[PDB]
Amino acid sequence: DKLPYKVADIGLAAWGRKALDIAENEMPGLMRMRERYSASKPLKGARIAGCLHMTVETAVLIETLVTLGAEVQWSSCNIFSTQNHAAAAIAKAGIPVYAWKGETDEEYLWCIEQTLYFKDGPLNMILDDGGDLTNLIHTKYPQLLPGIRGISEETTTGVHNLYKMMANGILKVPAINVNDSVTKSKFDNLYGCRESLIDGIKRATDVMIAGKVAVVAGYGDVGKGCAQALRGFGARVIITEIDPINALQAAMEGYEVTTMDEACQEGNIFVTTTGCIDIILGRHFEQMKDDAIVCNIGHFDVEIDVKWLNENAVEKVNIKPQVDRYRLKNGRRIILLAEGRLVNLGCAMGHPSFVMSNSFTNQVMAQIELWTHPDKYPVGVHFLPKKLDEAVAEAHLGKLNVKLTKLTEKQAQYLGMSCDGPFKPDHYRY
Amino acid sequence: DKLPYKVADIGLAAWGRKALDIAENEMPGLMRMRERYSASKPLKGARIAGCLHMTVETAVLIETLVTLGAEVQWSSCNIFSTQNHAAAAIAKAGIPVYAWKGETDEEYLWCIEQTLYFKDGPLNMILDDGGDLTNLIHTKYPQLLPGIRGISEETTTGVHNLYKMMANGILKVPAINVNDSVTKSKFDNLYGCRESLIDGIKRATDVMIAGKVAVVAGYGDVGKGCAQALRGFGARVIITEIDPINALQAAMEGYEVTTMDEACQEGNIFVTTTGCIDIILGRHFEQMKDDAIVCNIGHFDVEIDVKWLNENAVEKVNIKPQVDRYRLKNGRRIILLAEGRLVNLGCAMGHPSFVMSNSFTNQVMAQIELWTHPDKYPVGVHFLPKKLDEAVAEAHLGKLNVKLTKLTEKQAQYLGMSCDGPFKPDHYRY
Amino acid sequence: SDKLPYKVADIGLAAWGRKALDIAENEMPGLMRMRERYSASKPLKGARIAGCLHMTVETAVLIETLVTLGAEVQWSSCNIFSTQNHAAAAIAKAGIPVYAWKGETDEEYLWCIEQTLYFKDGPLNMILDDGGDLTNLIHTKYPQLLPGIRGISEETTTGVHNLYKMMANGILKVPAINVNDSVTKSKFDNLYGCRESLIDGIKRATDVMIAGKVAVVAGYGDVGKGCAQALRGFGARVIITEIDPINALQAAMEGYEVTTMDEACQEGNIFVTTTGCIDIILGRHFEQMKDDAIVCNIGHFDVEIDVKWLNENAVEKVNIKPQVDRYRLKNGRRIILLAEGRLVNLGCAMGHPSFVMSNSFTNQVMAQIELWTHPDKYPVGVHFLPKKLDEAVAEAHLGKLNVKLTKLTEKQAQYLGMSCDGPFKPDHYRY
Amino acid sequence: SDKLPYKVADIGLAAWGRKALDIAENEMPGLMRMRERYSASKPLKGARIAGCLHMTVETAVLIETLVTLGAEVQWSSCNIFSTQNHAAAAIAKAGIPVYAWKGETDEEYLWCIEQTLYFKDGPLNMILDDGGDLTNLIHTKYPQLLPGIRGISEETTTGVHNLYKMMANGILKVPAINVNDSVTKSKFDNLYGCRESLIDGIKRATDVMIAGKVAVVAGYGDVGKGCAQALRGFGARVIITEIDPINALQAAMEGYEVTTMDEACQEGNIFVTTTGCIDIILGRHFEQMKDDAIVCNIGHFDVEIDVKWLNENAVEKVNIKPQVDRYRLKNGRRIILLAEGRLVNLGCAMGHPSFVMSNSFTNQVMAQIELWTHPDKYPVGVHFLPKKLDEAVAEAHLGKLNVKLTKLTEKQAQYLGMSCDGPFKPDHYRY
Ligand SMILES: NC(=O)c1ccc[n+]([C@@H]2O[C@H](COP(=O)([O-])OP(=O)(O)OC[C@H]3O[C@@H](n4cnc5c(N)ncnc54)[C@H](O)[C@@H]3O)[C@@H](O)[C@H]2O)c1
Ligand SMILES: NC(=O)c1ccc[n+]([C@@H]2O[C@H](COP(=O)([O-])OP(=O)(O)OC[C@H]3O[C@@H](n4cnc5c(N)ncnc54)[C@H](O)[C@@H]3O)[C@@H](O)[C@H]2O)c1
Ligand SMILES: NC(=O)c1ccc[n+]([C@@H]2O[C@H](COP(=O)([O-])OP(=O)(O)OC[C@H]3O[C@@H](n4cnc5c(N)ncnc54)[C@H](O)[C@@H]3O)[C@@H](O)[C@H]2O)c1
Ligand SMILES: NC(=O)c1ccc[n+]([C@@H]2O[C@H](COP(=O)([O-])OP(=O)(O)OC[C@H]3O[C@@H](n4cnc5c(N)ncnc54)[C@H](O)[C@@H]3O)[C@@H](O)[C@H]2O)c1
Ligand SMILES: Nc1ncnc2c1ncn2[C@@H]1C=C[C@H](O)[C@H]1O
Ligand SMILES: Nc1ncnc2c1ncn2[C@@H]1C=C[C@H](O)[C@H]1O
Ligand SMILES: Nc1ncnc2c1ncn2[C@@H]1C=C[C@H](O)[C@H]1O
Ligand SMILES: Nc1ncnc2c1ncn2[C@@H]1C=C[C@H](O)[C@H]1O
Known part of the structure; x- marks a missing residue:
């Protein structure tokens, strides 16, 4: 058969919501994404296989992907990082989760595998953190590869291997380097x-x-x-x-x-x-x-x-x-x-809920990009557009009550930039 | 009858030691006091009633008092601050403890009371944090008062009332203001x-x-x-x-x-x-x-x-x-x-174990002072001697590997102070 | 000939000028490293550098470094108030044409720059600019000297901003290097x-x-x-x-x-x-x-x-x-x-203090060497120094601060997939 | 009479002197508060203050404040290099005997102090010292002027250290106030x-x-x-x-x-x-x-x-x-x-910047008023200003920084057992 999921204790579901409920109010980003795409369901048809620390924050992401209409199956990218009540909350939500704090190397590998196949076929997308999922497929499931539309990596070590793979003609699916998205590496990491x-x-x-x-x-x-x-x-x-x-x-x-x-x-x-x-x-x-x-x-x-x-x-x-x-x-x-x-x-x-909203907002945008505009991402690793990156950051200003200054028409010209569009060169290092 | 103690779960005793064991290696102060008085047993005959947060650190203190030879009975000075495994460790040690995380106002009051009477009479000493114990006795057990040799208060709010009491002819036993001991207020608090x-x-x-x-x-x-x-x-x-x-x-x-x-x-x-x-x-x-x-x-x-x-x-x-x-x-x-x-x-x-070694070392010194030199403390509130205060601090320099400078004979004279004795005026504010 | 051999507030400050340079040099292991490595080869031989950057003690050490590498040099400040007179004088006394003094007037400012354009053996070969005033003046008032110039080397954010604007509008006519956005510059000097x-x-x-x-x-x-x-x-x-x-x-x-x-x-x-x-x-x-x-x-x-x-x-x-x-x-x-x-x-x-400036200027000297010795390597447009050279700049100041760097082991270098020597990070790394 | 009416590096700096004082006064709400509260009453009337404290812009504002309160004043710096000439001159031009200039010699230093000891109507009544040099000089070379002095006011840690040493050795012969260890001084000025x-x-x-x-x-x-x-x-x-x-x-x-x-x-x-x-x-x-x-x-x-x-x-x-x-x-x-x-x-x-100095000096002025107006309140020995006055000093600079202080409610003041106005902390409080 196949278990509909596997967590330490589904009983924690209640407390799970408690936490998610509060974390959502700290993640104006993901929440902004939800109220903007819940209708259009841009991720409709996507079968996302996630392999990222199963934490409260992650849960808010997971449900966000769902609200956008993507089937999702999940596992943690580390045996100790799972947060059980958050794990449970998601399981109870009818979303296949395979994670629990204190897995064994075998169980770890076991969980990932349980997310590869969906009720209507293999994964369309890969949302990875560390490269374990993307690495597993390229090495043990090369057959599912031509079935995958895009990879979305979040941490430095993962992205490091993506570049290594592409550089060695091994990368077989378009991937987006979310980690090196300004509002991620320069916030989440730091x-x-x-x-x-x-x-x-x-x-x-x-x-x-x-x-x-x-x-x-x-x-x-x-x-x-x-x-x-x-x-x-x-x-x-x-x-x-x-x-x-x-x-x-x-x-x-x-x-x-x-x-x-x-x-x-x-x-x-x-x-x-x-x-x-x-x-x-x-x-x-x-x-x-x-x-x-x-x-x-x-x-x-x-x-x-x-x-x-x-x-x-x-x-x-x-x-x-x-x-x-x-x-x-x-x-x-x-x-x-x-x-x-x-x-x-x-x-x-x-990491605290807030900063994670940044990382994950980029993550959702990445998924939407690869899935809705495949023809825009050749096999290889790309960065989100700076204008989208700025957007991520803008989305969290209201919550911190930051009042941004609007470049005047006169000024925008002097500076030679849109009072809206990109505010800095691709090489800007913030 | 009378329960030999009361904790959430004596089972945590094992893990209790684990924690104490490690905390002791972070408290060179108390540990210094132990290896200097374990033999002489300066607190012999003392029946100390403690009412201070029952935490791992506190446990190291409690056993220190014991190693010095003082009978001890304890309760927390707050209903939520108790750390159960530390509570248990002490109970298992055959020391009457009456505390557990999540007490009720009644249970709180109940615990303190269980520490007032020992197998051989009422308390000789009061080691308080907040003034609840010292306040309870002065108001509900004035009879035990003339049986008590000294009060030793540790926090700002407690000491504040001690001064208020003395100022209103209500303080009936000599007390030492440990909180305002330099190495306490200027470290622990901050x-x-x-x-x-x-x-x-x-x-x-x-x-x-x-x-x-x-x-x-x-x-x-x-x-x-x-x-x-x-x-x-x-x-x-x-x-x-x-x-x-x-x-x-x-x-x-x-x-x-x-x-x-x-x-x-x-x-x-x-x-x-x-x-x-x-x-x-x-x-x-x-x-x-x-x-x-x-x-x-x-x-x-x-x-x-x-x-x-x-x-x-x-x-x-x-x-x-x-x-x-x-x-x-x-x-x-x-x-x-x-x-x-x-x-x-x-x-x-x-607070972390280390800084607490300071607070508690002063606490032990205070107890030794009131108990071994009663005739040196009239009814009222006093401060430990600056030289003892400096000692406390000196005791934790080795652990942080700080190399102190020794004032030369020539310099000590210029400055007009002992290259050993007090290094600053009573009014110095550090 | 009338052309003044230079013009400063008071040549008398020359003495004190050296005092300051002398000390600043011991704070700039970078430029000093460049000198003891190229003083012989004279890589900048034949170059006629027109500099337009704040005439300060630090700048003086740079100026002499360029000279030690064998480049004729004529200088002016890129601001009317930023000149440090004793440093200005020291350089004048050194027989190097300087045209700057604290408290110039807009006219005098413009006057100084102009005095640096022509050398005893022809017009400038190179432009070492800070702000874009020099490079801007030439493109707009001396377009004919342009095809005579081999490369531009810009140092500050505002200057580099215009370089990109110019290239973007088909106006940039000479290869330029963006020194400011060199990691060891923008992330140190600026900050x-x-x-x-x-x-x-x-x-x-x-x-x-x-x-x-x-x-x-x-x-x-x-x-x-x-x-x-x-x-x-x-x-x-x-x-x-x-x-x-x-x-x-x-x-x-x-x-x-x-x-x-x-x-x-x-x-x-x-x-x-x-x-x-x-x-x-x-x-x-x-x-x-x-x-x-x-x-x-x-x-x-x-x-x-x-x-x-x-x-x-x-x-x-x-x-x-x-x-x-x-x-x-x-x-x-x-x-x-x-x-x-x-x-x-x-x-x-x-x-800025002498030390951090050694970084900026070391990049500046490297830039000059690049454009002058390897023209065919820089098409008209704005480029960045190679990351390996950038890392070098930083490495050069570690000894002075007594920083002991760790050497990636063979076993490790492979795991990381990088030379235990070569570039340690992706071009997009933001430090 | 030969006695110079003062001695400074260059009286010409007087103009620029005012410029600086003028601005420093707007940074010293403390001294300025003292002036508008005592300028009328002239509480220091009759006092002949001999000051020996760094002759700086800030000090000048203090000096004039003492004057506005009606005390004759003669001054010298407590260090040969700390004098600020334009501030020195401004004061000289104000008709106040100043004897200081940047770059004095040990002899000149000692010479200046001496010139402040005697006034047109007799020897000093008060000593405003910073370091103890003045108070030390009198006790050792002018013991007879001693029984003529009403009080000492010391400002720095080293000076106060000697005061305690002197009292401790039966040598202190005049009441002194320890301004340095006044909370709003040691915990602000010093730090x-x-x-x-x-x-x-x-x-x-x-x-x-x-x-x-x-x-x-x-x-x-x-x-x-x-x-x-x-x-x-x-x-x-x-x-x-x-x-x-x-x-x-x-x-x-x-x-x-x-x-x-x-x-x-x-x-x-x-x-x-x-x-x-x-x-x-x-x-x-x-x-x-x-x-x-x-x-x-x-x-x-x-x-x-x-x-x-x-x-x-x-x-x-x-x-x-x-x-x-x-x-x-x-x-x-x-x-x-x-x-x-x-x-x-x-x-x-x-x-130190003007602002923090307003604190030090406000304590200094208060000290002078105390010793001079309430002698019978200070036996021979060293004392501290009252905590309530100390708090006042601090309160006086809150407006300038636009700090909105909270007023302890009646209900609260009682719980805490303190005046919603009076002292807010025990004498041993270490802030
Ligand atoms: N745990 C978290 O929440 C989280 C968040 C983001 C990234 N990370 C991880 O942090 C790691 C790297 O950090 P970044 O900050 O991600 O990347 P970097 O900043 O790319 O990371 C490593 C740094 O260490 C240096 N370094 C490399 N090998 C070294 C060695 N042998 N000795 C000493 N220094 C060495 C490099 O020069 C580099 O600056 C990755 O493993 C990434 O996945 C963890
Ligand atoms: N939780 C802990 O680990 C710990 C450690 C030591 C002390 N404490 C407690 O902290 C408290 C006080 O701190 P200290 O640092 O102990 O003493 P303070 O430093 O004596 O404490 C209170 C400070 O708040 C100010 N204040 C008083 N009433 C105020 C009001 N209504 N509004 C705004 N400010 C007001 C005072 O001027 C004072 O500086 C006491 O309750 C003491 O027991 C807790
Ligand atoms: N004086 C020095 O020693 C020195 C050193 C290096 C750079 N600079 C100068 O500093 C300036 C820019 O700094 P960087 O740090 O160089 O560049 P940035 O960091 O590129 O500089 C300006 C920053 O201000 C923001 N900004 C732009 N217009 C604004 C407006 N109207 N209101 C509010 N914020 C606005 C931008 O978003 C940008 O982050 C340039 O003029 C550069 O030449 C001076
Ligand atoms: N220049 C200024 O603006 C200014 C302002 C206030 C005070 N001061 C001066 O600063 C000095 C002291 O500072 P405070 O901060 O005034 O007093 P402290 O804080 O009383 O000063 C000296 C400190 O150094 C330590 N110390 C003493 N002898 C030492 C030795 N041989 N080696 C190492 N450490 C030693 C002491 O333990 C003490 O903490 C005095 O000379 C005082 O007059 C200068
Ligand atoms: N609370 C959290 N939830 C999910 N991922 C987290 C997290 N804290 C840190 N991480 C991640 C672990 C490594 C990354 O790069 C970062 O995104
Ligand atoms: N870990 C700990 N153990 C015991 N007492 C503690 C503690 N952390 C803070 N406290 C005390 C609580 C109030 C005090 O003044 C301080 O001594
Ligand atoms: N002492 C100094 N000498 C030369 N240029 C300096 C300087 N201090 C700052 N600058 C520069 C002024 C603007 C630049 O970007 C920076 O390099
Ligand atoms: N600008 C200034 N004017 C006068 N005294 C000053 C000063 N800056 C520092 N000081 C003093 C020098 C030693 C003192 O304790 C301090 O008050």
């Missing part, structure tokens, strides 16, 4: 983490940030957010980078920039925002100070060599779900969070 | 809140701070912490004050200072750090923007007229424990947290 | 630079306390962001105006109240225009400001503040000191205008 | 003031970029806290030294690395001493600093930096500009010393 990272750490450890030395590997949008968040509370943030520019920026902002080999001997807290392997190794673990807290916030759990801890620790006491305290041979201890998996979602609730 | 306030709000609402207008009533140590914490995340903090100095300080720090009547029409988040009644009234509730989040962090729940909400709201949907969303007659909604009770403890875990 | 120079200009001109006041900053671009942060850094309540949703949203996300000038004009004690356009602060605004509100601009051209309305409607105009005039409007209240609407950091102070 | 003036002094003297550098700040008291925050505000990595656990812990809690000068001397690019004592930066330290490290002090007395070791061990001493000398040690590296170790904000800039 502002989002600035608030969710500490959240995850706190809920998991309740340790005081102030007065401690935190080490943050990477100074990209996510690094910048985490770093600022930490010192905001009184921690002395030390930063590592491989890129001169990012590195110089850190130093210009007042952070000491060094190598992990050095900083591993000072940090009381470690956060990897890098997008790559081998950031914190045994060499590092062994020199850390007693009870140093190690966690990652990159998409994939590959930056912290957790296995070395399981394989070299004299003990592994588990304090609570997603929190294990190791005792190395030297006698000192180390607190590892969410087993190296992105801590904000694993140990907290991820 | 730094503590800076990290715990957002914690409580987040866990309770997961709302984004950035881009919103937060209103903070009061700019004292607690106000300063909350305000800084909020803008730290990107909120536009508006402040109210009745004191010119505090007011001027705010403005000097860049915050707009106004009256609640004005700010009530702008805030998306409201936090009362005042120590008094009638801060946010119906007048205010009615003008707030949709879904404004209202919470208090003052000791007593008297700053927000919650009753007006229960009495004038068209609805009261309860989202989750300690979170109720009202819908006024005007149609807009209001999210009230912990029913007006101090949000950091009610909706989170309160 | 970090102002963050430190704006307050400088205001302070030296007024010595007013920032803390406790309401400052209004029009625009939240790289320059706006810098100014805003600088102001609240000192305790001022920064209010921001914007026409762009994104920039606007960012401000709000950073905690600044975003409104319209019409509203904020009634609250500000300090006003700073970082916009790049006309009509930002008008009479409507001036009339509602609070007593002694301080108004200043930091955009390249003095067109954002309607200064003329003040000269034409003020009951008084007392001049406190050079570049500082205090007006008294008919309503009785007063208004303090700085540098007559001209970019305050340079007009009332010394502009 | 906020430096937060803005320190960078000012450094910038005007060196124009170096703060961002990306490592600054070392010795001491984390009100002045340390201000300096530290100011520096990182611009992007510098602030390292702090302290001898006090509490201050030390606070730094760490605020995110600053706290160490010993011996360690930090090898890292700092900028050094600022906010300590109040001797031997902070020695030869040991100078020798390990990085090339061109900038060393400066902001403590009252120039005793924290062993300048003499530099004059005595440097291979060179090139003087860049007034108050700026660049040394070259034997190791070849250089060191930039500012104002010769003397408080940099005043020595290399204009000191």
